[PDB]
């Protein structure tokens, strides 16, 4: 693949172009996933990691104290201050007006602040056009969608046929569907698509760390097509220093990226 | 196909038995779907339909003024007063602790008040065990799950294989998975399963059509209150239509 810098210059999706530029300018392809229960801790960790990430994957629906003024406002301030995007990992799986409102309104009003979100292909292409319209209705800021073509959970029904169908759905709108949450390259280059491949389940194979050893290494995934590495507890759990781990994973991911290039 | 009363006495799932009993006692297999945007209208519509429904399918996440005290509290009081269950049509599609918390906590705290909810089969069997343990942790009240084995949206990827995969997921736990949102009978009686088949998109497909096909509950939406129609009048219309079709079955 071309460099993040090059991809940013030609990408049809404004939100994707913005992300590639963030990655290029900050030398990072690290996505932090900080699944904590309080806004206070979330904000603390986000500020510590801000300089080292290009994206923050959130689950505002697991917070015990979510609010637009207390959570979203400060979060957006940090995203602007440190220059990284927000990705709400809601995994939408409905269609019609219901899904539009689940994305644009309700209590969370996701589309008003989340640069990126994701959806399952099972419901069909209507989820793409639906979410896109919902975004247009409540915000002028660039928005993007990641499809879930292959699931990693045990017993998932994401067969080869299912994956192909989801890829076909992604192909319906290159201005809005910017990529996939996946464990491998999904092609598409020959047909004019430049998909962001964001990969979770990534570690650095640290000695004595059983939990971390359940994941693939940063170099493994990046050398195999991953554009962004999604890292969670390895950045702040068990008494770790978020700034130190943020730099460690950022450096490792960037070095792996430079090597594949 | 046994009667609702008979199915209630032998069902392994407490919430399913509870629903079957409500259906038999109130002579109704009608589930109201009132997708309005304000709590005030929702409560008004629910109060009017309460006597004629066995279930209320909700989307509290589309409300413009949702609150635990202003929406859920009164809603629960209505369900207790008129004897009908609550079903939040959230269509969960995640696993692990994330999905457990999306069901038990967050702002909506679904598991705390919703007797029933649903999930997609795509994520695998983990969705059943995860939601089951989440429900057990938050309350001792009966809770149940409906699987989505076949979708009706254009271009959906719910193939025959996908449907089989979801049915197997449903079969993994008869104590918690009570049935499917479907357009037809899903069988299972030969293997010891008694699934509740709840069918949407019904009007006066006709009520008689779906009920005679194997649908146990009819889900009706706008046809019950939109266009300035009278909720109570329409509630009886559909309740009568659905119950009589059931008796003829």
From Swiss-Prot, chain B:
GO terms for biological process: 'de novo' pyrimidine nucleobase biosynthetic process; 'de novo' UMP biosynthetic process; UMP biosynthetic process. There is a cross-link at residues 91, 240 (Glycyl lysine isopeptide (Lys-Gly) (interchain with G-Cter in ubiquitin)). The keyword Acetylation applies. Changing residue 89 to A: Reduces activity over 100000-fold. Changing residue 158 to S: In strain: +D4. The gene is URA3. The active site is at residue 91. Pfam families: OMPdecase. It is an enzyme of class 4 (lyase). Substrate binds at residues 35, 57-59, 89-98, 222. PANTHER family: OROTIDINE 5'-PHOSPHATE DECARBOXYLASE (PTHR32119:SF2). This is Orotidine 5'-phosphate decarboxylase.
């Amino acid at each position: 693949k071309a460099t993040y810098k090059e991809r940013a210059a030609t990408h049809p999706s404004p939100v994707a172009a913005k992300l590639f530029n963030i990655m290029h300018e900050k030398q990072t392809n690290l996505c932090a996933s900080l699944d904590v229960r309080t806004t206070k801790e979330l904000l603390e960790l986000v500020e510590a990691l801000g300089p080292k990430i290009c994206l923050l994957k959130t689950h505002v629906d697991i917070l015990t104290d979510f609010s637009m003024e207390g959570t979203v406002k400060p979060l957006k301030a940090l995203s602007a201050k440190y220059n990284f995007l927000l990705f709400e990992d809601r995994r939408f799986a409905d269609i019609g007006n219901t899904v539009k409102l689940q994305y644009s309104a309700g209590v969370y009003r996701i589309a008003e602040w989340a640069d990126i979100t994701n959806a399952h292909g099972v419901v069909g292409p209507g989820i793409v056009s639906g979410l896109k319209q919902a975004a247009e209705e409540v915000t002028k800021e660039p928005r993007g969608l990641l499809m879930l073509a292959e699931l990693s959970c045990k017993g998932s029904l994401a067969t080869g046929e299912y994956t192909k169908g989801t890829v076909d759905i992604a192909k319906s709108d290159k201005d809005f569907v910017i990529g996939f949450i996946a464990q491998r390259d999904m092609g598409g280059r020959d047909e004019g698509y430049d998909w962001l491949i964001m990969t979770p389940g990534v570690g650095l194979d640290d000695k004595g760390d059983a939990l971390g050893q359940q994941y693939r290494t940063v170099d493994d995934v990046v050398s195999t097509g991953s554009d962004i590495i999604i890292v969670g507890r390895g950045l702040f759990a068990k008494g770790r220093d978020a700034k130190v781990e943020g730099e460690r994973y950022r450096k490792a991911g960037w070095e792996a990226y430079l090597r594949r290039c």
